[PDB]
Design a protein around this ligand. Structure first.
Ligand SMILES: Nc1ncnc2c1ncn2[C@@H]1O[C@H](COP(=O)(O)OP(=O)(O)O)[C@@H](O)[C@H]1O
Ligand SMILES: Nc1ncnc2c1ncn2[C@@H]1O[C@H](COP(=O)(O)OP(=O)(O)O)[C@@H](O)[C@H]1O
Ligand SMILES: [Mg+2]
Ligand SMILES: [Mg+2]
Length: 552
C-alpha cells in the first residue's frame, strides 16, 4: 500500500465507526513486525476482541504476542478512564453539596465528549512517555482524536471552573499543560505522525471523512493518507443483480470523490471473503431465507397508537432520512396526516410529492445554518463577561457535535409545537446526553419539555442501526444513554440487511450470515420489537419506490 512506506514513529487512524479501523491497524502492525521493526499496537475499543485475534489476553499492561516476534500489544479503556474521572471529581463533593450540583456534575462528565477527552488523555499519556516511545520504534493506534478535541486541548485558559457547553471533561485533566502541548506538537509534526483516514466507498461516508480531513488540515496536520476499505470485487457480481448494483454504486462513489480529498494519496482494499477473525485472515488483508418482521408491523403499531411522534435516532450514515421518508409516505398513503421534517439539504427524498398528496407536508431544516445561528446567538450571551481567552474557549467549545445537536433539536421544537393532532416524523433525535443537560440547565429558541419525550404515549424513539458488530455496540451504547435519560426506545430498525435481500454469491452470503448473527443478537438482548429493512438494489430517492422499503 501507499501508507506503509518509510512510516514515521506514530501512526493513527480515524473514520466512521465500523469501517475497519481495527482490522487495518492490526494488519499494519503484523506487517511491520514481520518486516523487523518493533511495534506497539494500541487498541481503543474495550470490546474490540483484539486479544482474541492475536490469541493472547491484552490489558492495560503491555504484553508481547508470542506468535509474532517483535510485536507488543496494549489497550486503552476510555470508559474506564471516564468512570475514574467521574469518581475522583464527584466523590469529594458527594454528601456535602446539593443534589442539583451533583446531578449537574455527573451529567457534564458523562457522554461521548467525556469518552473522547479521556481517550485523548490516554493518547497523550502514551505519547511523550519515559520509555514507551523510546523502546518501541513504531506505535499504531486504532482511533485518532477528533479535530474538536485537538483544538480544545491546545487552547489556553483556566479549566478549574467546570450552559450547555461541554468544557466539563477538561476540568478532570490532571496532567500539566506542557504535557498536552508537547503531545499536540508531536501529533501535528509530519515527521512523527502520519494520520490515515479509513472510509467506506459510499457517498455519505466519503463526505463525512472529507469533513474530518478539512478539520484536521485546519488544525495543522499537513500530510495524510486515504485508505478506501470495502471495495466489492467486480467479478463477484457475475450473476447477482444486487452485487452488480452494489458494484455500480461503489464505482460511482470512487469516480466522484470530494474535491478536498483528491490530492491525498489513495489506496484500495478488496473485501476479502475470508472472515477477519484469525491471524491468517489479517495477514493477507493488505495484499438462505431470512424471515423477520418488516416495517409493516412497526407502521401498524404506530397507526394503532396515532397522534404520536416517530423520532428516529442513530449514528450518521445509517439511512435515518430514507427510513423517515418511507414511514411518512406510508402513513400518508393510508390517509392519516404526516409532517416529515427531514434535515438532509443535500438531497430531496419526498420532492414533488407534497402537492400530489393532499395531507403530506415537509419542513427542510439545514443543520449547518441552524448550528451557525445558535453559535452566533450564544456568542453574545456569556461572551461579553468572559475575557478574550474565555470567549475564544467558548467559541471553540461550541463547535462540538453537542452544540450542533442542540441547535437541530431547538429548530425541531418549533415544528413540534406547531403540529398538534398530527403525526410528526423526525430525522435525528438528540442523544441522551443532550436531553439530560438541556433539562437540568433549563430546570428565541425554546426546547420541548422532557415530560413529553419521556412519555411512552407520545414519543416513540426508534433506533436505526446498521447490521454489523461496531454499529450494534454503539447503538446499544446510545440506547443505554437514552435509558439513563429516562426515555425508552420503542423499537429497533436494522437497516441494509443483505440477508433480507436476495443474495446468491459467496461474499454477499457471508455478509448475510454475519448480519443474521447481528439481527439475532439484537432480537435477543437489545430490543423487544425489531424490524429489518433490506438493502434496496435501486437507490431510494423517489416517491413511489420508497414503498419498496415498507413492503419488501
Ligand atoms: N477489507 C475487509 N475485508 C473483509 N472484511 C472486513 C474488511 N474490513 C473490515 N471487515 C469486517 O468488518 C468487521 C468489523 O470491523 P472493525 O475492525 O470493527 O472496524 P472498526 O474498528 O472501525 O469498528 C470485521 O468483523 C471484519 O470482518
Ligand atoms: N434501506 C436502504 N437500502 C439501500 N440504501 C439505503 C437504504 N437506506 C439508506 N440508504 C442509502 O444510504 C445513503 C445515506 O443515508 P442517509 O439517509 O443520508 O443517512 P442520514 O440518515 O445520516 O442522512 C443514501 O444515499 C441512501 O441511498
Ligand atoms: Mg474498532
Ligand atoms: Mg441524515
Amino acid at each position: 500500500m501507499k501508507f506503509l512506506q518509510l512510516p514515521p514513529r506514530f501512526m493513527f487512524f480515524t473514520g466512521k465507526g465500523g469501517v475497519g479501523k481495527t482490522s487495518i491497524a492490526c494488519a499494519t502492525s503484523i506487517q511491520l513486525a514481520n518486516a523487523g521493526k518493533r511495534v506497539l499496537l494500541v487498541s481503543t475499543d474495550p470490546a474490540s476482541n483484539v486479544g482474541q485475534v492475536f490469541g493472547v489476553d491484552i490489558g492495560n499492561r503491555v504484553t508481547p504476542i508470542p506468535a509474532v516476534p517483535h510485536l507488543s500489544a496494549l489497550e486503552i479503556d476510555p470508559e474506564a478512564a471516564a468512570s475514574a474521572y467521574r469518581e475522583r471529581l464527584v466523590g469529594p463533593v458527594r454528601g456535602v453539596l446539593p443534589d442539583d450540583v451533583v446531578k449537574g456534575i455527573e451529567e457534564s462528565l458523562s457522554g461521548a465528549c467525556t469518552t473522547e477527552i479521556a481517550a485523548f488523555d490516554e493518547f497523550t499519556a502514551l505519547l511523550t512517555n519515559a520509555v514507551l516511545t523510546a523502546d518501541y520504534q513504531h506505535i499504531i493506534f486504532d482511533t485518532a482524536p477528533t479535530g474538536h478535541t485537538i483544538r480544545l486541548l491546545q487552547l489556553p485558559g483556566a479549566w478549574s471552573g467546570f450552559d450547555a457547553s461541554c468544557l466539563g471533561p477538561l476540568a478532570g485533566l490532571e496532567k500539566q499543560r506542557t504535557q498536552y502541548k508537547a503531545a499536540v506538537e508531536a501529533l501535528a509534526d509530519p515527521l512523527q505522525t502520519r494520520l490515515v483516514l479509513v472510509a467506506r466507498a459510499q457517498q455519505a461516508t466519503l463526505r463525512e471523512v472529507a469533513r474530518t480531513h478539512e478539520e484536521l488540515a485546519t488544525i495543522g496536520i499537513k500530510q495524510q493518507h486515504l485508505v478506501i476499505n470495502g471495495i466489492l470485487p467486480s467479478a463477484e457480481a457475475a450473476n447477482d443483480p444486487l452485487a452488480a448494483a452494489i458494484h455500480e454504486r461503489e464505482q460511482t462513489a470512487l469516480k466522484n470523490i470530494p474535491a478536498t480529498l483528491t490530492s491525498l494519496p489513495r489506496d484500495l482494499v478488496q473485501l476479502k471473503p475470508f472472515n477477519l477473525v484469525g491471524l491468517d485472515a489479517l495477514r493477507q488483508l493488505l495484499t438462505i431465507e431470512l424471515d423477520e418482521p418488516g416495517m409493516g408491523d412497526l407502521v401498524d403499531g404506530i397507526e394503532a397508537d396515532g397522534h404520536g411522534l416517530v423520532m428516529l435516532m442513530g449514528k450518521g450514515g445509517v439511512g435515518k432520512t430514507t427510513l423517515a421518508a418511507a414511514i411518512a409516505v406510508e402513513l400518508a398513503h393510508r390517509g392519516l396526516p404526516v409532517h416529515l421534517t427531514t434535515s438532509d439539504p443535500a438531497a430531496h427524498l419526498t420532492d414533488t410529492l407534497e402537492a400530489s398528496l393532499d395531507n403530506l407536508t415537509v419542513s427542510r431544516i439545514d443543520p449547518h445554518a441552524e448550528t451557525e445561528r445558535y453559535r452566533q446567538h450564544v456568542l453574545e450571551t456569556k461572551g461579553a463577561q468572559l475575557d478574550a481567552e474565555g470567549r475564544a474557549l467558548l467559541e471553540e467549545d461550541l463547535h462540538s457535535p453537542c452544540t450542533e445537536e442542540i441547535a437541530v433539536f431547538q429548530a425541531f421544537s418549533r415544528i413540534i409545537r406547531e403540529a398538534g393532532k398530527k403525526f410528526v416524523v423526525m430525522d435525528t433525535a438528540p442523544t441522551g446526553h443532550t436531553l439530560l443537560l438541556l433539562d437540568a440547565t433549563g430546570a428565541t429558541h425554546f426546547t420541548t419539555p422532557m415530560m413529553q419525550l419521556r412519555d411512552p404515549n407520545q414519543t416513540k424513539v426508534l433506533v436505526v442501526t446498521l447490521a454489523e458488530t461496531t454499529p450494534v455496540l454503539e447503538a446499544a451504547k446510545l440506547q443505554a444513554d437514552l435509558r439513563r435519560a429516562g426515555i425508552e426506545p420503542w423499537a429497533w430498525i436494522i437497516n441494509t440487511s443483505v440477508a433480507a435481500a436476495s443474495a446468491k454469491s459467496p461474499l454477499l452470503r457471508q455478509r448475510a450470515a454475519n448480519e443474521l448473527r447481528e439481527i439475532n443478537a439484537v432480537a435477543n438482548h437489545h430490543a423487544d420489537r425489531y424490524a429489518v429493512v433490506p438493502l434496496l438494489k435501486e437507490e431510494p430517492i423517489g416517491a413511489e419506490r420508497l414503498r419498496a422499503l415498507i413492503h419488501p
